[PDB]
Amino acid sequence: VQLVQSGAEVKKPGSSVKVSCKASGGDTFSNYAISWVRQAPGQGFEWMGGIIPIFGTANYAQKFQGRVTITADESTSTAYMELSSLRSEDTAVYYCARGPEYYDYVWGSYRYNYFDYWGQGTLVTVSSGSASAPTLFPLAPSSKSTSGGTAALGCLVKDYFPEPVTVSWNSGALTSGVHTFPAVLQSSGLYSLSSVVTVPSSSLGTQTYICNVNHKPSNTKVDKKVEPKSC
Amino acid sequence: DIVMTQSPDSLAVSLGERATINCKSSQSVLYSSNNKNYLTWYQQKPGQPPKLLIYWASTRESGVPDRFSGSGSGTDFTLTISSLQAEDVAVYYCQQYDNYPITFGQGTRLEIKRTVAAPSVFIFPPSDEQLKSGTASVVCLLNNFYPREAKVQWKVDNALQSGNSQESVTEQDSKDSTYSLSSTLTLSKADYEKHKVYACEVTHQGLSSPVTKSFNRGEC
């Protein structure tokens, strides 16, 4: 069971967004419910609504009723949540989630319960600011970043907007010892973060180290080689 | 609407010991038709979606380790993690589905205790590429320490800096229960080139006295 969502976007206040969630192995669209829940950065969760694809019937939280539509396309096993008249407060990671249904013998209806699988989430930022790609600067390994048989090196991922970025090292081949720090929103209105990795210092003359950054909101990918300091 | 309130907001527990998280609902979430509490627990790690642990208050989801247990009824619920493991570092959330709208508690962060670990301290001058652009970012890295408290001070030509650095800390790492921190000092190119000696001074419980890492601008 796998739920794959559309990518992160920046949207202007007053616009609409449509987020997709595709299920792949359908049991899901035939026997389950699909819900949308959002999470503002640094906070908890709000259910927006859900649908039972085989019936086409959808319920929504009062606070979104009139402004949100959830649909589901059984031939593409894809569900969608369209949210209109976007406001700053709609900035959040939007998750689709699947769960089973139970029958309510008093309502005479199938109802949503717990969610058993969640998709990876889609960060939608509502802002009048335009998207901007990051610039990558090296954090070159040197005598001042080595200890014992270990060296630290990294990537400064500077001046992008909005979140998120994905940072990988060597196309995802290097994962051990990596720390990618949380971004800070700078006075300029742009984000920055560093990503660092510790490696054997004995590797520096022979192993290539590339920082790979993907910034979906500006449709940019950047790769930067990080080489040891040479005097 | 049902308000879900978790307690405590954060806890730190020793490995192999018991962690207890509470959740209280503003009204009963006991569904009479089948006499089940419509109360669920989820685990969320950073950058990751939530994962189901327990439903109907006390039924474990298939694949979930038996050290996870749920109990309670009506309005008062507990998630108990026995024999706590490193991989249990996460934020835990309760959720009700008795009443529409479905509602969630605000999360409880669980962190783990461990022995003191001093940071390894590293420094990075700004790149020549960045300086060409008019700005200098100088980065001081405090790698793999515990506990999270540390003092980090920049000195530029021996003058303590104020208001021009920014600190970011990672969430606790499952592999060794440590934190890492980046301190970035930002200067204009013109200010960066007025001074020579750049230093970051780190004080931590694991260091018998504060550690300074420094460089001289322009030097090997």
Side-chain angles (χ1 to χ4, degrees), chain A residues 58-175:
Chain A
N59 279 274
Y60 305 104
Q62 252 152 357
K63 77 179 278 180
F64 309 107
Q65 194 176 339
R67 192 146 87 84
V68 61
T69 301
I70 293 169
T71 51
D73 185 342
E74 278 205 318
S75 69
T76 65
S77 312
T78 302
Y80 297 95
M81 189 278 310
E82 184 161 41
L83 177 69
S84 68
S85 299
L86 291 168
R87 299 151 188 198
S88 294
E89 296 74 21
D90 296 321
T91 295
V93 174
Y94 289 78
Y95 289 100
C96 68
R98 188 191 89 165
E101 301 144 58
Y102 73 95
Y103 193 74
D104 182 309
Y105 282 110
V106 295
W107 287 30
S109 172
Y110 282 99
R111 295 180 69 178
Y112 313 98
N113 65 19
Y114 69 83
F115 309 131
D116 60 352
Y117 290 102
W118 298 58
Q120 82 279 22
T122 295
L123 181 50
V124 175
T125 302
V126 177
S127 183
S128 72
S130 301
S132 187
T135 299
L136 280 45
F137 300 115
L139 304 164
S142 81
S143 66
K144 296 300 175 161
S145 79
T146 62
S147 191
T150 291
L153 64 113
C155 194
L156 173 61
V157 183
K158 194 117 196 315
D159 286 346
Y160 68 90
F161 186 78
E163 286 267 66
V165 289
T166 61
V167 181
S168 63
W169 286 85
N170 296 349
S171 294
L174 178 54
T175 55

Side-chain angles (χ1 to χ4, degrees), chain B residues 93-170:
Chain B
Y93 295 84
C94 61
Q95 179 234 110
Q96 69 83 32
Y97 51 101
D98 191 31
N99 189 264
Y100 300 161
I102 283 165
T103 59
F104 297 79
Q106 79 279 10
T108 293
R109 179 170 306 279
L110 174 71
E111 283 179 317
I112 46 181
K113 291 179 187 205
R114 66 108 99 198
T115 59
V116 176
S120 291
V121 183
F122 303 113
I123 194 167
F124 306 91
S127 72
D128 291 348
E129 178 177 3
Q130 193 188 14
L131 283 174
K132 185 189 189 62
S133 84
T135 300
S137 300
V138 201
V139 173
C140 180
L141 171 62
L142 282 59
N143 215 216
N144 305 348
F145 61 98
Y146 184 93
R148 51 151 40 80
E149 297 90 6
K151 192 165 66 185
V152 178
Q153 289 195 158
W154 286 94
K155 308 197 193 191
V156 174
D157 289 352
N158 227 31
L160 186 62
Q161 299 300 282
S162 193
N164 55 356
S165 72
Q166 284 164 331
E167 286 76 45
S168 176
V169 201
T170 60

Side-chain angles (χ1 to χ4, degrees), chain A residues 166-219:
Chain A
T166 61
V167 181
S168 63
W169 286 85
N170 296 349
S171 294
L174 178 54
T175 55
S176 182
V178 173
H179 300 294
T180 301
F181 290 93
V184 170
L185 178 62
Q186 285 162 112
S187 47
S188 63
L190 313 158
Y191 287 93
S192 184
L193 57 80
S194 283
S195 177
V196 302
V197 56
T198 50
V199 299
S201 50
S202 67
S203 78
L204 293 175
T206 54
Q207 178 63 60
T208 295
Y209 292 103
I210 302 168
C211 172
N212 319 116
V213 174
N214 180 23
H215 187 242
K216 187 52 172 54
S218 74
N219 288 318

